[PDB]
Design a protein around this ligand. Structure first.
Ligand SMILES: CCCCCCCC/C=C\CCCCCCCC(=O)OC[C@H](COP(=O)(O)OCCN)OC(=O)CCCCCCC/C=C\CCCCCCCC
Ligand code: HEM
Ligand code: HEM
Ligand SMILES: CCCCCCC[C@H]1C(=O)O[C@H](C)[C@H](NC(=O)c2cccc(NC=O)c2O)C(=O)O[C@@H](C)[C@@H]1OC(=O)[C@H](C)CC
Ligand SMILES: C/C=C(C)/C=C/C=C/[C@H](OC)[C@@H](C)[C@@H](OC)[C@@H](C)CCc1oc2c(O)c(OC)cc(OC)c2c(=O)c1C
Ligand SMILES: CCCCCCO[C@@H]1O[C@H](CO)[C@@H](O)[C@H](O)[C@H]1O
Ligand SMILES: CCCCCCO[C@@H]1O[C@H](CO)[C@@H](O)[C@H](O)[C@H]1O
Ligand SMILES: CCCCCCO[C@@H]1O[C@H](CO)[C@@H](O)[C@H](O)[C@H]1O
Lengths: 365, 441
């Protein structure tokens, strides 16, 4: 009830406010399909990949549970990025506590999805585990020690896969708890709305207005998920993970899961190890800085044309980075990727805050 | 005697009719005083947007002087014999009545006849009353109860004559002309639309002769093109919320469409309304009151007061309740109230219905106590039912009601039906219409 029924809600929130519930649904979907996959999966490097093919070939409906889990992960990120985008555009980040927990949630889901991708032990699994864990080797003096500690040896091996199964199993439940805190902080203020103006003078009950909208949204999410699972289950996946892990050979066109491509492009744009890892980390952590960079006298971008243009430039730029992350490190992609990487940080750190100040002067305040 | 034999001892109401259509009805007793008056089928339901408020304006002029008794002459005559002259207008009926010594019945009938037929309507008086009415409109604005009930009619009967207030909009008050009034009068104040009623120490034959003597000139024709008939009024499930956080308490009125005067179902509905009852902070019963709504409200301090009602009009009506409460108690009050309507629709018990029946029996008889309440019952009944319904009949109708009848009748008017809702004051907590609608099932 104090999470539904009589909860006061703005009368004017749009469908962009539907992603919070879709994220909750994605998480429950992942936990359910995941638990059922865990009932058949074995984490020994000699049997991991085989146990997954066993799930898809001989377990009753094992294939639909497996592909719902795989594509569910993709739907999770689509929803995450839409959710974060909504927050940025409408200035929802001014709810500092809710927003910062939000940042933690994004990072935890990324870590969870990374480890999950490692479980089937395919080629992408093994090299992703290799590359991502090695990000820690960028830490001075103790980096290498930390990596080997995480691996449980001098290289990714048996000990690594077994602990990744354990971490992947439990983290989602921690995410669920953190999500509940995310919501407890939000309830203290109530939701933001498209105009960015307090909606206390025009609130409506959550039920039936948004309970029905949430259900409609849930149905559409399920339609999208099942269109992928039933008509194109491998569309968003990588063919290379259908090949067992081979520690002596890295595929020549290896690339990250689609939802990690933009960050990959940013890291690849910097011909310095520490520099790339720092840029990678900052590409996500900069989210925690957004509230401090807010210069506008108005909360939402609804009434700010300049900010809007820059916002869409930032989206187009992330799309640019996503595209580049999927191309080989060759001309002209190298330069485009570097320009796109620079623009990303330039937009967030300089252009948007500056546009806010310009807009303020234009309105004489 | 038993309550049963006492019922059969009430003198039967005598009814006669003049050539011009005027009905004359009376109930004789041995009281040395009486009440006699004229009830008319005229009210704002008969008015259009152009002349809405005409009837109320006329009420203001009715006692200000007649052609035979100009100015305060009518007034002096009423007062000098120690009589009392009063009047009232509703959306369907208008009444002018006098309380006087029984021996003064002849002069009383003459004065009423004079009032109803020879009203002066002096232009200067009309201008004075214009200001009086405007001031009364301002005063009425301070009565949250009157405001909420006018709002309930405005929304429940939106787009129909019943949506109109009796007093009319202020702009009509500023513009109504004598022409408008004389016109209204020639059209509505006809003998076939009136009932001369009287109760007290007098005989029907005397009243009838006095009526023949003083009311025969009253028109009983009109014509054919100008015979104001009533069209049914559509009821609309809707809500009107006038938020004013400056007011200390919120007033809420909610109702479903009722059946209308003539319907037999009104008795069972009255029984059901008696079960839920009424309440206010000064009631001594508190936590022990029989009505669940009343005891819950009293023990939990949910409201200052509440009252169920069954407002009847020709072919429709407002069946529901009104409550006054603190801004934080509206949802709770609505929750308990709707829960009680649903409990009656699905689970009314024989014992609570018997209580309801006994409450209704007591209300009926205790209401007809005195010549004025009786005279009003005669006048109104003749206009609405076309006859005076005797107590023995009311008892028979009440007797026929049991738990089964209450569940079925309540289900017919309350269950899964769209209500009309009116709120005024600090109503931020008044439930959304969808939530109220879902509460109906
Ligand atoms: C992470 C990287 C992932 C790769 C990036 C791929 C991005 C693909 C683009 C998909 C975007 C499609 C949605 C376009 C919507 C078009 C539209 O309606 O725009 C105008 C419209 C006007 O609304 P108002 O100003 O409130 O006024 C209402 C007047 N009646 O604006 C909006 O709807 C604003 C909503 C913004 C949310 C969009 C978010 C898209 C995703 C961005 C990623 C987020 C950024 C940071 C994540 C990285 C860490
Ligand atoms: C497991 C992931 C997450 C879940 C389950 C989740 C869930 C929710 C829910 C249910 C709402 C309310 C409905 C809505 O407005 O969408 C909400 C609001 C919000 N969330 Fe999240 N969220 C998640 C991740 C994040 C992330 C990654 C961020 C940002 C870095 C974030 C920032 C916010 C903010 C600022 C609001 C307020 C929105 C507004 O009212 O304008 N959330 N979230
Ligand atoms: C935030 C929620 C979760 C996310 C984002 C997530 C994501 C993933 C990803 C990306 C994969 C690889 C899919 C593939 O291509 O094969 C995976 C595998 C796996 N996940 Fe999850 N997962 C989540 C929750 C869970 C939970 C709660 C469990 C177990 C209790 C679980 C069990 C598994 C198992 C056994 C595998 C290996 C089988 C397979 O590859 O399909 N997951 N997960
Ligand atoms: C016990 C009750 C607990 C119920 C917990 C869930 C909850 O609080 O449900 C709510 C409807 C919530 N939604 C909102 O607050 C909300 C607010 C404004 C607009 C919309 N939709 C459109 O405008 C909303 O959907 C929403 O979707 O959160 C889930 C994320 C929660 O789930 C979790 O935290 C777990 C994953 C568990
Ligand atoms: C024990 C647990 C540990 C160590 C967890 C740590 C998790 C760290 C981060 O999550 C918080 C991390 C997942 C997140 O960085 C912000 C991603 C955007 C990293 C993106 C990423 O992916 C790749 C990938 O998937 C690959 O697959 C085949 C291959 C890759 O190059 C060959 C990459 C790669 O070069 C990068 C930068
Ligand atoms: C819903 C529309 C998503 C965009 C469709 C293309 O999707 C792309 O297809 C490629 C070849 O099949 C894959 O290698 C790549 O990983 C995938 O993201
Ligand atoms: C979004 C802007 C597109 C980027 C254009 C990159 O352009 C390329 O830059 C290289 C840098 O060494 C040059 O050697 C090469 O000749 C040039 O075509
Ligand atoms: C629900 C019962 C409907 C019919 C009730 C009629 O009731 C009857 O009406 C007569 C005329 O008024 C009375 O004389 C008689 O005593 C009474 O019992």
């Amino acid at each position: 009830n104090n999470a539904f029924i009589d909860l006061p809600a703005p009368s004017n929130i749009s469908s962009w406010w539907n992603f919070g519930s879709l994220l909750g649904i994605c998480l429950i979907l992942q936990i359910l399909t995941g638990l059922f996959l865990a009932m058949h999966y074995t984490s020994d490097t000699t049997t991991a990949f085989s146990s997954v093919t066993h799930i898809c070939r001989d377990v009753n409906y094992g294939w639909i549970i497996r592909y719902m889990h795989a594509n569910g992960a993709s739907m999770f990120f689509i929803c995450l990025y839409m959710h974060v985008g909504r927050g940025l555009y409408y200035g929802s980040y001014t709810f500092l506590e809710t927003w910062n927990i939000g940042v933690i949630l994004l990072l935890t889901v990324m870590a969870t999805a990374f480890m999950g991708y490692v479980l089937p032990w395919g080629q992408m699994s093994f090299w992703g585990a290799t590359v991502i864990t090695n990000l820690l080797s960028a830490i001075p003096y103790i980096g290498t020690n930390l990596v080997e500690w995480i691996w449980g040896g001098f290289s990714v091996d048996k000990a690594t896969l077994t602990r990744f199964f354990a971490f992947h199993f439990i983290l989602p439940f921690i995410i669920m708890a953190i999500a509940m805190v995310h919501l407890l902080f939000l309830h203290e203020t109530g939701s933001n709305n498209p105009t960015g103006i307090s909606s206390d003078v025009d609130k409506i009950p959550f039920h039936p207005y948004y309970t029905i909208k949430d259900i409609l949204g849930a149905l559409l999410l399920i339609l999208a998920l099942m269109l992928l699972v039933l008509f194109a289950p491998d569309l968003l996946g990588d063919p290379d993970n259908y090949t067992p892990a081979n520690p002596l050979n890295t595929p020549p066109h290896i690339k990250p899961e689609w939802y990690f491509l933009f960050a990959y492009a940013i890291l690849r744009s910097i011909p310095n190890k520490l520099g790339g890892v720092l840029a990678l980390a900052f590409s996500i952590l900069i989210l925690a800085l957004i509230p401090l960079l807010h210069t506008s006298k108005q909360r939402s971008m609804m009434f700010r044309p300049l900010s809007q243009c820059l916002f869409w430039a930032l989206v187009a730029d992330l799309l640019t980075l996503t595209w580049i992350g999927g191309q080989p490190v060759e001309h002209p992609y190298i330069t485009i990727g570097q320009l796109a990487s620079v623009l990303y940080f330039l937009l967030i750190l300089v252009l948007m805050p500056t546009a806010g100040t310009i807009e303020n002067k234009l309105l004489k305040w | 005697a038993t309550y049963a034999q006492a019922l059969q001892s009430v003198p039967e109401t005598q009814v006669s009719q003049l050539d011009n259509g005027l009905r004359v009805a009376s109930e004789q007793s041995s009281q040395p005083t009486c009440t006699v008056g004229v009830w008319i089928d005229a009210g704002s339901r008969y008015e259009s947007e152009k002349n809405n408020g005409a009837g109320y304006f006329v009420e203001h002029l009715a006692f200000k002087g007649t052609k035979n008794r100009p100015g305060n002459a009518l007034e002096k005559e009423v007062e000098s014999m120690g009589a009392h002259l009063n009047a009232y207008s509703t959306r369907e009926h208008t009444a002018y009545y006098i309380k006087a010594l029984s021996k003064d019945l002849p002069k009383a009938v003459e004065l009423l006849a004079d009032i109803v037929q020879n009203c002066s309507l002096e232009d200067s008086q009309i201008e004075k009353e214009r200001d009086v009415i405007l001031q009364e409109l301002q005063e009425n604005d301070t009565s949250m109860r009157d405001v909420v009930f006018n709002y309930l009619h405005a929304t429940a009967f939106q787009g129909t004559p019943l949506a109109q207030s009796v007093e009319g909009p202020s702009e009509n008050v500023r513009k109504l002309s004598r022409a408008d009034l004389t016109e209204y009068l020639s059209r509505h104040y006809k003998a076939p639309r009136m009932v001369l009623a009287a109760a007290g120490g007098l005989e029907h034959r005397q009243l009838l002769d006095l009526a023949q003597k003083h009311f025969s000139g009253l028109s009983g024709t009109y014509d054919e093109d100008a015979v104001p008939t009533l069209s049914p009024c559509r009821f609309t499930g809707s809500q009107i919320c006038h938020r004013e956080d400056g007011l200390p308490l919120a007033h809420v009125a909610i109702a479903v469409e009722g059946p209308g005067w003539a319907h037999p179902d009104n008795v069972a509905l009255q029984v059901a309304n008696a079960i839920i009852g009424h309440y206010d902070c000064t009631y001594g019963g508190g936590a022990h009151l029989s009505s669940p709504l009343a005891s819950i409200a009293a023990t939990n301090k949910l409201c200052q007061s509440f009252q169920t009602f069954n407002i009847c009009y020709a072919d429709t009506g407002l069946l529901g309740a009104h409550f006054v409460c603190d801004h934080m108690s509206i949802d709770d009050m609505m929750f308990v109230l709707q829960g009680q309507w649903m409990r009656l629709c699905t689970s009314a018990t024989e014992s609570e219905v018997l209580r309801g029946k006994n409450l209704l029996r007591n209300a009926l008889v205790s209401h007809l106590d005195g010549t004025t309440p009786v005279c009003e019952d005669i006048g109104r009944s003749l206009l609405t039912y076309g006859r005076r319904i005797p107590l023995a009949e009311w008892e028979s109708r009440i007797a026929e009601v049991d738990a089964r009848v209450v569940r079925e009748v309540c289900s017919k008017y309350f269950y899964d039906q769209c209500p009309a809702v009116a709120g005024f004051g600090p109503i931020e907590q008044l439930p959304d219409y969808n939530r109220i609608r879902s509460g109906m099932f």
